[PDB]
Amino acid sequence: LALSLTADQMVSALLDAEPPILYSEYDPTRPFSEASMMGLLTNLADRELVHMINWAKRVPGFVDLTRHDQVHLLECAWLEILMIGLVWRSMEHPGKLLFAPNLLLDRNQGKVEGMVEIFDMLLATSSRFRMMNLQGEEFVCLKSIILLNSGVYTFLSSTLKSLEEKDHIHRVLDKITDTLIHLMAKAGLTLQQQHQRLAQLLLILSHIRHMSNKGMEHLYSMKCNVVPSYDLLLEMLDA
Amino acid sequence: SLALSLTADQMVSALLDAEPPILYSEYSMMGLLTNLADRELVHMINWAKRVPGFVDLTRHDQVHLLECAWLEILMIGLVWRSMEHPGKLLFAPNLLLDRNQGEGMVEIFDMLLATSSRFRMMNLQGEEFVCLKSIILLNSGVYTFLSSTLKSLEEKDHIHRVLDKITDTLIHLMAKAGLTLQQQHQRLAQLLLILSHIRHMSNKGMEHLYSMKCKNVVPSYDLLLEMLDA
Numbered sequence A: 001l002a003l004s005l006t007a008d009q010m011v012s013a014l015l016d017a018e019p020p021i022l023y024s025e026y027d028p029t030r031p032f033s034e035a036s037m038m039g040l041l042t043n044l045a046d047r048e049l050v051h052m053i054n055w056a057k058r059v060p061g062f063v064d065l066t067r068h069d070q071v072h073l074l075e076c077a078w079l080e081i082l083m084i085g086l087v088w089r090s091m092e093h094p095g096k097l098l099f100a101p102n103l104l105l106d107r108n109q110g111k112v113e114g115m116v117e118i119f120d121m122l123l124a125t126s127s128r129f130r131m132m133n134l135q136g137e138e139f140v141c142l143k144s145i146i147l148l149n150s151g152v153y154t155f156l157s158s159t160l161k162s163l164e165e166k167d168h169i170h171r172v173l174d175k176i177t178d179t180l181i182h183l184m185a186k187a188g189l190t191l192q193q194q195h196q197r198l199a200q201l202l203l204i205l206s207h208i209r210h211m212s213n214k215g216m217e218h219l220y221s222m223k224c225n226v227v228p229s230y231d232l233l234l235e236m237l238d239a
Numbered sequence B: 001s002l003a004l005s006l007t008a009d010q011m012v013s014a015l016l017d018a019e020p021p022i023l024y025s026e027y028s029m030m031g032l033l034t035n036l037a038d039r040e041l042v043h044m045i046n047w048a049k050r051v052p053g054f055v056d057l058t059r060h061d062q063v064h065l066l067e068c069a070w071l072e073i074l075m076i077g078l079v080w081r082s083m084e085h086p087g088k089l090l091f092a093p094n095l096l097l098d099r100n101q102g103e104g105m106v107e108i109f110d111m112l113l114a115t116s117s118r119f120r121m122m123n124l125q126g127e128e129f130v131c132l133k134s135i136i137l138l139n140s141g142v143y144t145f146l147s148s149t150l151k152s153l154e155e156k157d158h159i160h161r162v163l164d165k166i167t168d169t170l171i172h173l174m175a176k177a178g179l180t181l182q183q184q185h186q187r188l189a190q191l192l193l194i195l196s197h198i199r200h201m202s203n204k205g206m207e208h209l210y211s212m213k214c215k216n217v218v219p220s221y222d223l224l225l226e227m228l229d230a
């Protein structure tokens, strides 16, 4: 089971679980309009969705959850997860968001003003990871943490099983924390640097939550989808 | 620079000394929060000026931090107040609400409750608490300064440096309470992850103000700037 993994076995499992990078619908009309871009982002996200489920089911400890909790965690975290993907992808492309390898946009290219604030936010984050020289093995830990953390406070409670599930999530989070710290020691950071890096990394998740909330906000503000329903996800979950 | 030299114990002591008082609700739900919020904000600005590192920022930077953190700061105070009242939110000593007295915003109410209860199972400590509060003041708005000029870059480093001193401070508090090296970093992580949840609740909150046509209760950049300058 998942709580038994060493830190080395946790990084390995997480690396192996990695989803693939997808391409954007090939050769769209350029220049873009506001909706054409959104049609492209939306299409891409939907296609990534399928793969994130495959990825989520291989996150040590995810499967031990009832289906209901697996869905609720994904519901809450999916955009955050895409967004950290993006920001990772974009690190060595100052000024640009690499949504797909055939879809690399600067702040002017794509066609709203609330959108450009998010874009700006994604760019900032990406620089920050670049500044911190974020490592791949750290990124997979962070992405996993996002998955297990984002929706855990809103399980709601009561029943003993509801408490068990929350307690299990929290224990997996702890091993991921042990894993991050292990990577940091391994790399030769002092304890003090280790603690500090861990904090700096985790604080960034709060910004990623914020951006997701902003993004979700916008998504709900179109008369179109375009946001995976509970049943959609449940289904996608049964093997 | 001052702030960067503090010890873990001096940092905590500065932070406890700076705590706002707990105010009473003076005397519709939106009515009561607005009355309370408005009075609390005055105190929050004076608390903020006392957070080590914070006055070393430019006034425009102080304002942006506050503008970004204000609801999360209210909210976290609320969760800490309610910690010892499971099932209830202690808005004020004379305004302690249960889930059922909770029109819209029962979602936010529930989340608030869940956070409080998370606090309670964690045995969250007053000293840890004040450290998290400060972390939020300095973290929530730092990624959106605007870099550009040399100053804005110097301001960002300085914030990150203070944040690191709050990190050392939390760890010190845990090492001193007896936690093992392992338990220290797991607890530091559990603490900070909760902050994502607070951000989340704050955003839902704002969302809810705008759909209540209550956009007005928000402190504006200029409102904030005038209060700081006093």
Ligand SMILES: CC(C)=CCn1nc(-c2ccc(O)cc2O)c2cccc(C(F)(F)F)c21
Pocket (backbone or CB within 6 Å): A041, A042, A044, A045, A048, A082, A083, A085, A086, A099, A114, A115, A116, A118, A119, A214, A215, A216, A218, A219
């Ligand atoms: C241009 C802006 C402000 C984007 C925010 N955003 N980002 C992605 C996304 C899709 C795939 C991916 O891998 C990573 C992503 O971040 C995305 C997908 C749908 C809607 C939005 C939104 F929120 F803008 F409406 C999205």
Ligand SMILES: CC(C)=CCn1nc(-c2ccc(O)cc2O)c2cccc(C(F)(F)F)c21
Pocket (backbone or CB within 6 Å): B030, B033, B034, B036, B037, B040, B074, B075, B077, B078, B091, B105, B108, B109, B112, B204, B205, B206, B208, B209, B217
């Ligand atoms: C100005 C307004 C109404 C903000 C909205 N607000 N304010 C507080 C809050 C206020 C003061 C305080 O001491 C503690 C609090 O938690 C609060 C708590 C729960 C939900 C909301 C909601 F949904 F309106 F955003 C809240």
